[PDB]
Write a protein that binds this ligand. Structure first.
Ligand SMILES: NC(=O)c1ccc[n+]([C@@H]2O[C@H](COP(=O)([O-])OP(=O)(O)OC[C@H]3O[C@@H](n4cnc5c(N)ncnc54)[C@H](O)[C@@H]3O)[C@@H](O)[C@H]2O)c1
Ligand SMILES: NC(=O)c1ccc[n+]([C@@H]2O[C@H](COP(=O)([O-])OP(=O)(O)OC[C@H]3O[C@@H](n4cnc5c(N)ncnc54)[C@H](O)[C@@H]3O)[C@@H](O)[C@H]2O)c1
Lengths: 376, 427
C-alpha cells in the first residue's frame, strides 16, 4: 500500500530521506543514482529547452508528507527556497488525516482557446452565425490532433463573446472549449485556434488577429475540502475551539480586504507552485489562472473559504483553475519531473490538479493557524 | 563600459556562453568554476533552506542580452523551463536599443504591515485615536531595527482602515508604512507589526490578531517604458506601421477582456519570474503583488499599456508592485543567486525591480508582436522552419513542434533544430 507518512524526516540526513523515498516508491537504482548526484538535468538537454543556456539553477527539493486525498496517500515533492513552507504543508496534512484526509473533485480538463475577430460591422449577428455553424467549427478544430482525439479529448464546444465598442472597433471573440486530457493544453489549443481561423473569417467576414489560449481557465477547476474538529486542533495552551474562532477571524479578514487577500492567496501559492515546478509544469500559467480567478467577483479576494459545520468543526474549501499536465511541455522531458510524477503515482492530470488544490488549502490553513495562534 | 550585447550567442555552446559571461563580468576563477559544474547549491546548504530536503531541482539557466535600462547595459539571468521566453526578451530588448533602451523609475521601497484589531465597538472613533497617536506608534515600530534606521529606512507613516460590518464583528486594520531599503522586507515588517501590537491594543481597547505584511505592495511600484519607431519594427514581410496597429489590436483585447488579460499578464510574468528565481527572490510574492494589482480598478486587466506617440511610434508602459531584495532570504544564501546579482551589477533593490519591469514589458511586446503578425496561413518563414525541422530528422507531430520553437526563437537553422529535436526525443 502507498504510504505518505514519513518517519521522523527532520532527524534523517538528506541522503537517508532520499533512500527512504527510493525504497518506499520503488524507484529503480538508476533513478536513485539520478537523485544522489547533482546535474540530473543534462546541460545539453537544458540547452534544447530554452535559449542562451549557460548553466542550471538549483532549488531545494523537499517532500511534504501525510497528504491523503480521496482515501489515497500521496507524497508531494516541492521545489522552493522559503523556510517553513514544506513543514507547514506536512503538519497540516497530518492534522487533516484525522478526518480521513482531503476530499477533492474537479471538472473535465477543459481549456479555452480564443479567436479574436476584427472588422465585423455586425458582431451580434455574426455571433449568431458562428454559433449556428458550431458543428462545422468543432469538426475543423478536431481534424489534426489524432492522438488527443483518440484519447477522447478535442474541441467539445464553442462560445462567442462580443465587445461591440472598443478603440479598435468591435471585437468578436470565439472561445473553443477543448478537452486536453492529461496535458496543460496551451500549445494543443493554440493550434486549433489557428486551424479554425480561415473558417471563422469566412463565416464572420472579419479578420482574425490573436489565436491564443486563455490562462483564465475557469472551466478547468480543481476543488478540495478539509474538516478538522476542535479535538484535532486543540494544543496544550489553546483549545481547539479558540484556534477555530481565530482561524475564522483570519479568513474573514482575507474575504473582505484585498490587502490581506493578496497575502492570504500568496500563502496558498507557496503550497501549489513548488509542486508545479517539481513536476515540470508551467508555474506562471497556474499563478495567472489562480489570481485572475480570485477577482472574478469584481474584487480581489480569498480563493479559500473557512467555516464551521453544524457540530463546530472547521471546514475549509478551495476552488481554482488548475491547468497542469502529466504530459507535454517539460513534464516528461526533465528527468526529475518524470521522477517527481512517478513518486506521486498519478493516473490523470485532474488527479494532479486535485492534489495541488489540497496542498494549497493545507498551506493556507498552516498560515491562518500560525498567524492566529501567535502571542502578543 | 557595461555591455549587454551577446554576439553570436545562438551559435555558442553553453560552455562558451559561460566563459564569455565570466570574462565580460570579470568573474573570479572561483565564480567561473561554480558555473563550470552542477551542484552550485550544496545539498547541506539546501538542507538548511527548506524542510525535508532530499535533493535539488534544476531549472535551465539562460541569459537575456541587449537590455539597456536608463542608459546602462545589464545582462539578465533567467531561470525558466519554457521555450522561447529568453529569446523573446533578448530580441525585443535589441529592438529597444534603437531608441536607447528602456526608461524606468520606482517609488520608495515602502512595504505595508497589517495589524488586525478585533473587538472594538467604536472602530471609527478608535481609528481617529490611533491616527492621533501616529508618532508614538511609529517610534515604537522603529525601536528595534537599528541597522535599518541607520540606512534611512524604517516605519515612515501609518494608515488605518475600518471594516465596521463583518461576520466576525468590526475590524480596524492599521497599516505600518515601512521603508525597507534593499530588502524584500517581509520579516522586517512582520517584526514591526508584532512590536506595536500592545500599544495598538492599549489605544483601541481591542484585541490584535494578525500581524503580517501585505503582498499587495502598491506602495512599492516599479515603472518602465519603451518606444519603437515603425522603422525599428519593420520586417521583410510586414511594415512597421501594420505591426504597430496589430500590437494595438492585441493590447485593447487584453484591456477589455479578463480572459485575454490573464494570458497577457502571464506573458509579462514569463519575463519577470525567471529573474526573480535566478536572484534568489520569492516569486510567489511577486506573482501575488502583480496579479492582485491587475484588478485594482474593479476588473482584472492588463498591467501594461500600448499606445502611439505623436509621430506614430509605438510606446509601451508598465507599472506594478516589485517587492524584491538584494539582502535576506535566499539572495545571499544561494551561491548562484549571489553570482546573479554580481552579473547584473545591481546597486539597489529598486534597480533590480526596475530592470525586471523592463524585462516584463519586453516579454509582453514579444508576445503581442508575434501573436499579431502570425499569418492566417503558413507564410514563407513558417514553411522554411518546417523544412529545417525535416532536414534535422523530425517527423510526424515533431515537425510543427520543432519549427514552432525555431521560429519563436529566431534561430531557424539546422544545428538548432538538432538540439531542439533531441530535447523533444528526451520524452
Ligand atoms: N500562456 C500560456 O500558458 C502558454 C502559451 C503558450 C505555450 N505555453 C507552453 O505550452 C506548453 C504546454 O503545451 P501542451 O500542454 O499543449 O503540451 P505539448 O504541446 O508539449 O503536448 C501536447 C500534445 O500532447 C499529445 N498527447 C499525448 N498524450 C496526451 C494525453 N494523455 N493527454 C493530452 N495530450 C496528449 C497530444 O497530441 C497533444 O497535442 C508549456 O511548455 C507552456 O509553457 C504556455
Ligand atoms: N507573504 C510573503 O511574502 C512572506 C511572508 C513571510 C516571510 N517571507 C519571507 O521573508 C523573507 C524576506 O524578508 P526580509 O526582506 O526582511 O529579509 P531578512 O529576514 O534577512 O531581514 C532583512 C534584514 O536585514 C538587515 N539589512 C541589512 N542590510 C540591509 C539593507 N541594505 N536594506 C535593508 N535591510 C538590511 C536589516 O536589519 C533587515 O531587517 C523571504 O524569505 C520571504 O520568502 C515572505
Amino acid at each position: 500500500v502507498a504510504d505518505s507518512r514519513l518517519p521522523n524526516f527532520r532527524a534523517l540526513t538528506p541522503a537517508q530521506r532520499r533512500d527512504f523515498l527510493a525504497d518506499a516508491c520503488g524507484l529503480s537504482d538508476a533513478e536513485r543514482a539520478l537523485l544522489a548526484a547533482p546535474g540530473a538535468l543534462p546541460l545539453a538537454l537544458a540547452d534544447g529547452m530554452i535559449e542562451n543556456v549557460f548553466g542550471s539553477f538549483e532549488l531545494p527539493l523537499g517532500v511534504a508528507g501525510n497528504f491523503r486525498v480521496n482515501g489515497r496517500d500521496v507524497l508531494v515533492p516541492m521545489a522552493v527556497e522559503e523556510p517553513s513552507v514544506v513543514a507547514a504543508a506536512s503538519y497540516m496534512a497530518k492534522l487533516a488525516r484525522e478526518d480521513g484526509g482531503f476530499q477533492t473533485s474537479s471538472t473535465l480538463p477543459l481549456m479555452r482557446a480564443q479567436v479574436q475577430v476584427l472588422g465585423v460591422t455586425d458582431p451580434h449577428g455574426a455571433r449568431l452565425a458562428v454559433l449556428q455553424a458550431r458543428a462545422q467549427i468543432i469538426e475543423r478544430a478536431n481534424s489534426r490532433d489524432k492522438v488527443l482525439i483518440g484519447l477522447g479529448g478535442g474541441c467539445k464546444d464553442i462560445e462567442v463573446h462580443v465587445f461591440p465598442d472598443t478603440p479598435r472597433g468591435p471585437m468578436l471573440v470565439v472561445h473553443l472549449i477543448v478537452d486536453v486530457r492529461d496535458a496543460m493544453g496551451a500549445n494543443t489549443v493554440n493550434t486549433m485556434a489557428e486551424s479554425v481561423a480561415p473558417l471563422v473569417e469566412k463565416i464572420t467576414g472579419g479578420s482574425v488577429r490573436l489565436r491564443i489560449l486563455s490562462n483564465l481557465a475557469d472551466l478547468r477547476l480543481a476543488r478540495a475540502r478539509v474538516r478538522l474538529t476542535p479535538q484535532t486542533l486543540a494544543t496544550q495552551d489553546r483549545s481547539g475551539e479558540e484556534i477555530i474562532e481565530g482561524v475564522l477571524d483570519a479568513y474573514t479578514f482575507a474575504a473582505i480586504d484585498p490587502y490581506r487577500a493578496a497575502t492570504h492567496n500568496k500563502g496558498i501559492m507557496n503550497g501549489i507552485d513548488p509542486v508545479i515546478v517539481a513536476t515540470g509544469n508551467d508555474w506562471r500559467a497556474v499563478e495567472a489562472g489562480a489570481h485572475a480567478y480570485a477577482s472574478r467577483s469584481g474584487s480581489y479576494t480569498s480563493l479559500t473559504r473557512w467555516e464551521k459545520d453544524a457540530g463546530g468543526a472547521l471546514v475549509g474549501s478551495i476552488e481554482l483553475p488548475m491547468p497542469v499536465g502529466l504530459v507535454g511541455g517539460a513534464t516528461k522531458t526533465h528527468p526529475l519531473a518524470r521522477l517527481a510524477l512517478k513518486i506521486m503515482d498519478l493516473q490523470s492530470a485532474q488527479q494532479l490538479g486535485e492534489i495541488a488544490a489540497a496542498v494549497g488549502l493545507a498551506q493556507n490553513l498552516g498560515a491562518l493557524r500560525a498567524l492566529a495562534t501567535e502571542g502578543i
